[PDB]
Amino acid sequence: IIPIPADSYTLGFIGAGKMAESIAKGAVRSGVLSPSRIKTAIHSNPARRTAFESIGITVLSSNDDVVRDSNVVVFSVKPQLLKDVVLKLKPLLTKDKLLVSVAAGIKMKDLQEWAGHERFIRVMPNTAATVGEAASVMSLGGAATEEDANLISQLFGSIGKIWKADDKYFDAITGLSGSGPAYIYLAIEALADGGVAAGLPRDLALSLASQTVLGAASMATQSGKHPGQLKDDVTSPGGTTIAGVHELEKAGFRGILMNAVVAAAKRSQELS
Amino acid sequence: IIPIPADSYTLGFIGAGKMAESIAKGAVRSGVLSPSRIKTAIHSNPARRTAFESIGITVLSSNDDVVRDSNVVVFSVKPQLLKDVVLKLKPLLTKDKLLVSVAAGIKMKDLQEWAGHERFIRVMPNTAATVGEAASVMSLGGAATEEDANLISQLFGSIGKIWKADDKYFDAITGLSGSGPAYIYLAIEALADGGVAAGLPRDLALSLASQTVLGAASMATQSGKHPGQLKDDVTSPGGTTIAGVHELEKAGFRGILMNAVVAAAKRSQELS
Amino acid sequence: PIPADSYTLGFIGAGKMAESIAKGAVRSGVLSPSRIKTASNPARRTAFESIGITVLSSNDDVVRDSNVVVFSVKPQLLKDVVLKLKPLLTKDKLLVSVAAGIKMKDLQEWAGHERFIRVMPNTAATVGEAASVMSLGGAATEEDANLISQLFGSIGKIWKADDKYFDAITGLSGSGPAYIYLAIEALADGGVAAGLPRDLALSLASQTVLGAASMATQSGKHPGQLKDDVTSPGGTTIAGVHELEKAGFRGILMNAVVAAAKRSQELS
Amino acid sequence: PIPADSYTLGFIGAGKMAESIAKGAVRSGVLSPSRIKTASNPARRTAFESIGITVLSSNDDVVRDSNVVVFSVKPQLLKDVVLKLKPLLTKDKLLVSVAAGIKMKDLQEWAGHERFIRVMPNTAATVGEAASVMSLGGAATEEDANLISQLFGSIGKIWKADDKYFDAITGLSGSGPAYIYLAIEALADGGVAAGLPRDLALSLASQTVLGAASMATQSGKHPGQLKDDVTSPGGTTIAGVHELEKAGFRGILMNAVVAAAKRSQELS
């Protein structure tokens, strides 16, 4: 358990999907890494190979060599495949390498057993990694150090925001930050549909819906205010806003979003 | 109707509230122009005076003089006060001066009648101007030129996004981009409450809710995809996301947000 | 490997579905009636003979003379029919089941080999607009799959899917037509409620549904984008869409598919 | 009589609908491009020229050279366009409006005669599956009606109805497609909710809806009878139907048609 060189470490991606690509592009764009310090492996796909080569990253032909040449290894293969991929690589997963999983649903306990050591970090990002606005959370294996954690905070700080949480919260986090985008995509469509129902042109309605939601969320993220206080700031007496809010409350809007989160968290638990 | 000098115009703020401050700071930050080209008038308030002076803007003691010395005049007084303010200034509101109103609910027809001419532009921003992510729309008076329009698009561009729309759409716009932030503030709180209901710590739940909403909206604003396609991208077969979406649909979630927009638009129309 | 242009096809079970597949294959020229065989009912006999197909008197002989065998007997009877024919079901013969609810695992065990394809069509086979899905046994080849794609392309559209999805498919493409029959009737009733004559209302409802689905199948657009294209500002379409959304219309159709899939699973 | 086999057709308004009609009429051989003429975008010129149709530079000349004239300009513009052309709108020329919301009474007053037919198509014209209805001006002949049935039979189906029904028709065939687009999406979402892949779920949802509607349009059966045909005892289909009925599904689609019809009436 030698510390990972903060400025000079090499990063290996096992699994070359969208999420790996988003992390690699983000890390390069923000200067956390240069492409020469990143490796990935691809077998079947010439298209995925292009995506990585086109940003200056060397694509090797085996997972084995990616691991050998990497200080930090990020596993992003489909969850059902991960176990076998880890077991295959096990002899090369020496304790001087920091391992990271972004696989949905795979608990720390299992990651550590498969790898045979506890220098492992688990990250659950979400779909907004693509535009650098992910909501990510990380949990630490029993041998992951504070310096390991900071290294991974910096890496994933390049695709959005990142927080720390106990592994036991990850089902619930899945129902909120993992699944929540889709609740907001519905909301944006419905707002647009509402604008059209009130007489707006479709393109304007949709533009305004998206940006209105973006704006409100930015107010929430930056203002340091409770959401109740933000709602109080825009609800003028007997005005348009409070009329709309009242309809939401009549229908139990808040409860409906609570139910979604809860059901999704419950499904996450059931999928084990 | 001489064109406004694009590089050398002077700007006057009648009404020195948060919205005027935001536009002024933004314009200066982004280099659209220097504080020396900007004037505002304040009577009662030494605190509002500080806010403007502290960014290098000269505060005069009368509205009359602000207008005299300005090519472009932005009215941001409370809507109920606007009519009387305009009527008082009317002799000074000559056709060579481009007028702009950010007042909620005041129609172009009325602006033009009060001012006695048609070189008037109406801008309806929303509350996210504070963090530079406003959803704004502009309508043009009968004598406002394309160049006038561009001058305003550029002036305002510091506070968010701006779209052009007929004045007749503005009641409805109020129900969507004006009032919509409060719908999202409810949504953020409800998502947080949902996370806590599923076992998450409050601070994490709130941080995730806000950033999950921000991320989704960013995906919608940048991706070029229909919201339905974005939802389809994140709904894995039999997964957590679709379970949550299903609860939203069972409850008529989209129809509720439509009802809010429509009721708010209806209230806007009733408030005249 | 089955001869692509000269194979013979045998139908075990001579019901509506087998008739539809036979007629479709002939109409479209995939097959000539002389290349088709099938095996109490004089009326069913007529249906096959009337399109030029030879009706034999035993299942055994249909199998002997066929490269490809399609089983369309009632599901509860299939096991015994297959076990009876087993000695004749040699590996050079591609077997196909259209039986509702019978898993690939079971088909393969009954036959004693894995050169088996499962197809689940739906009721619209009758008018050549079936929504069908196929799963492949462990020894079914790509060429076997293409042969069956071509055969069932003659009665509608066909897609590939893992056998494990077949319960859920049943709740969507199997059961979905009924959801649409209710919708057509309710649309007609709606037209009448708004003052239209009944015959017109019904004609419009059916052809409106047909037209919309054709737009969906051919446009390459997401349904949401299609809905956006027709929803004029403050117009008639959006007013109607708003009533749907107030009532949770989407959710109700999701519930139907989910409950039907759950029932399919329970029926094993 | 308009010459049934040799008439020339003129499009005043060169939007999507006019393009769909022109392409349909050509594809099906009702017309050759040389027998069609049209007269706001240099891009729209390409769309018509690219299928062999001559674009003229004035509405006046389109009319002069046409036996049959189809008005597809935006409804608010139609009155002024007709009034401008009035001296050229002689009684030997059959006039047609596809403009939403414009009553026969008004069309006839603007044109100064009653040899006018009104057609309300819907969005599925683009794929040749429109649901259209026509009403006849006081001087439109049976032969005029047949000519227009044939023309619009090239973009889907067409029925006759009194002008007074056109608000309600709008709520049903005009607005209905969107109801179906929501249905298709919801059925796909339902499939995914039951475990299906998205692409398969969507493909199946669209084709299932297309198939069902084809059964309705071709079978000659009442929708209730078609629902009875697919609802097996205690099976998957009836479990899904039951969920629909628990929620009042039929009523919701009735509400949509009614509210849309009401809005059409309000938009005058």
Ligand code: PRO
């Ligand atoms: O609550 C209201 O009426 C004002 C107007 C839109 C934004 N807030």
Ligand code: PRO
């Ligand atoms: O739907 C699912 O299961 C995955 C996990 C969260 C986002 N998509």
Ligand code: PRO
């Ligand atoms: O939404 C509307 O008003 C138009 C007319 C029917 C189809 N779309």
Ligand code: PRO
């Ligand atoms: O209702 C049932 O169970 C069968 C299966 C789908 C079509 N009808």
